[PDB]
Amino acid sequence: VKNGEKWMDRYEIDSLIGKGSFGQVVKAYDRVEQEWVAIKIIKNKKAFLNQAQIEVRLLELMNKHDTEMKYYIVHLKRHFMFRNHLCLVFEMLSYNLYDLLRNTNFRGVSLNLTRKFAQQMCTALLFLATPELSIIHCDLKPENILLCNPKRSAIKIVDFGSSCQLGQRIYQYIQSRFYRSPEVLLGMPYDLAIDMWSLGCILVEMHTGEPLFSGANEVDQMNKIVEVLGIPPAHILDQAPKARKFFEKLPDGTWNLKKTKDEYKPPGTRKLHNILGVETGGPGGRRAGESGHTVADYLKFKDLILRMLDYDPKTRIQPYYALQHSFFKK
Numbered sequence: 159v160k161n162g163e164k165w166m167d168r169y170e171i172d173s174l175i176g177k178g179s180f181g182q183v184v185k186a187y188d189r190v191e192q193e194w195v196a197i198k199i200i201k202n203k204k205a206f207l208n209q210a211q212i213e214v215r216l217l218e219l220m221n222k223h224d225t226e227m228k229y230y231i232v233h234l235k236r237h238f239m240f241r242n243h244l245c246l247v248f249e250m251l252s253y254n255l256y257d258l259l260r261n262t263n264f265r266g267v268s269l270n271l272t273r274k275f276a277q278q279m280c281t282a283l284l285f286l287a288t289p290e291l292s293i294i295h296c297d298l299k300p301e302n303i304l305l306c307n308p309k310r311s312a313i314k315i316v317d318f319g320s321s322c323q324l325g326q327r328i329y330q331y332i333q334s335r336f337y338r339s340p341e342v343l344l345g346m347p348y349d350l351a352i353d354m355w356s357l358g359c360i361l362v363e364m365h366t367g368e369p370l371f372s373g374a375n376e377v378d379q380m381n382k383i384v385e386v387l388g389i390p391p392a393h394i395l396d397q398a399p400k401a402r403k404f405f406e407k408l409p410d411g412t413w414n415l416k417k418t419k420d421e422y423k424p425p426g427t428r429k430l431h432n433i434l435g436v437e438t439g440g441p442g443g444r445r446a447g448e449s450g451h452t453v454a455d456y457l458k459f460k461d462l463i464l465r466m467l468d469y470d471p472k473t474r475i476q477p478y479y480a481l482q483h484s485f486f487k488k
């Protein structure tokens with residue numbers, strides 16, 4: 159697609175903004191609205207078109223709901239078919255939270271900026287949980303959270319290409335590996351709670367600069383999670399189709415790890431407080447004496463993250479109750 163093309167006496171293509179398995183995203187001048195827009199151009203392959211039609215349906219469903227929470231998700235302006243490609247037109251946004259970490263040389267941002275991100279992210283999750291929506295994103299990661307403006311800390315969620323409503327699930331293998339919830343690793347039916355799991359993983363990474371759980375495979379992934387949060391509850395592993403991919407049951411109805419060729423820190427011993435550096439002056443001690451990073455501030459953040467990383471998705475912290483947490487009290 160050329161960097162001067164004109165479409166439908168309406169759009170002038172400027173540049174490639176983004177690429178994907180879905181196709182590509184281009185910067186285009188909308189001659190009617192007289193503004194720049196982002197156009198998501200889907201490949202003319204049955205598979206991407208079908209999944210993108212679902213994304214359009216979910217996006218248009220959200221547009222029909224006027225609240226104070228709807229403006230944390232990229233607004234879909236419109237869509238059309240051109241040259242046999244489904245085209246989604248969005249408001250222009252800026253760079254993503256991963257690029258923001260890259261720009262800190264992976265040293266992380268302040269707890270204060272982390273809090274501002276958490277609050278927006280939790281308000282978006284609350285909006286998707288409105289019963290008549292009930293949309294699971296299924297691919298929350300730093301790369302799918304964009305700054306509205308390179309000067310500001312306003313963010314919006316993008317990419318509803320993996321998203322499904324509750325009880326419209328298609329795939330068992332969903333979510334980006336590092337952000338994949340245990341329920342989805344364990345091959346169990348997933349909720350809106352898998353996004354809260356992902357959000358917890360992201361918020362830590364935003365502050366430390368490194369992914370909380372960077373598995374090289376599903377097995378590696380679950381082992382890195384168990385290092386921090388210990389063995390999942392028996393009641394969960396008993397109902398889990400793929401419990402025996404990672405764990406083994408014992409005479410007395412208790413569970414342990416399947417082992418292979420040696421090494422990980424033993425279950426629950428890689429403590430989040432050390433990962434966060436609560437009482438050691440933040441991540442790698444780099445925040446020693448910096449304001450808004452009091453041990454009290456860090457402990458509230460630690461408490462909220464462990465509510466987002468509950469193994470049980472039925473007791474894992476839902477969004478309204480994450481906005482009530484002391485970590486957000488000024």
Ligand SMILES: Cc1nc2ccc(-c3cc(N)nc(N)c3)nc2n1CCOc1ccccc1
Pocket residue numbers: 175176177178183196198232248249250251252253301302304316317318
């Ligand atoms: C700069 C900019 N404005 C945007 C507005 C919307 C979207 C946008 C992108 C996608 N995949 N899905 C939706 N629903 C909206 N992406 C924008 N980008 C950067 C584009 O890069 C990407 C590419 C792939 C994934 C994420 C960001």
Ligand SMILES: [Cl-]
Pocket residue numbers: 256300369
């Ligand atoms: Cl990443």
Ligand SMILES: [Cl-]
Pocket residue numbers: 296297320331332333334
């Ligand atoms: Cl996915």
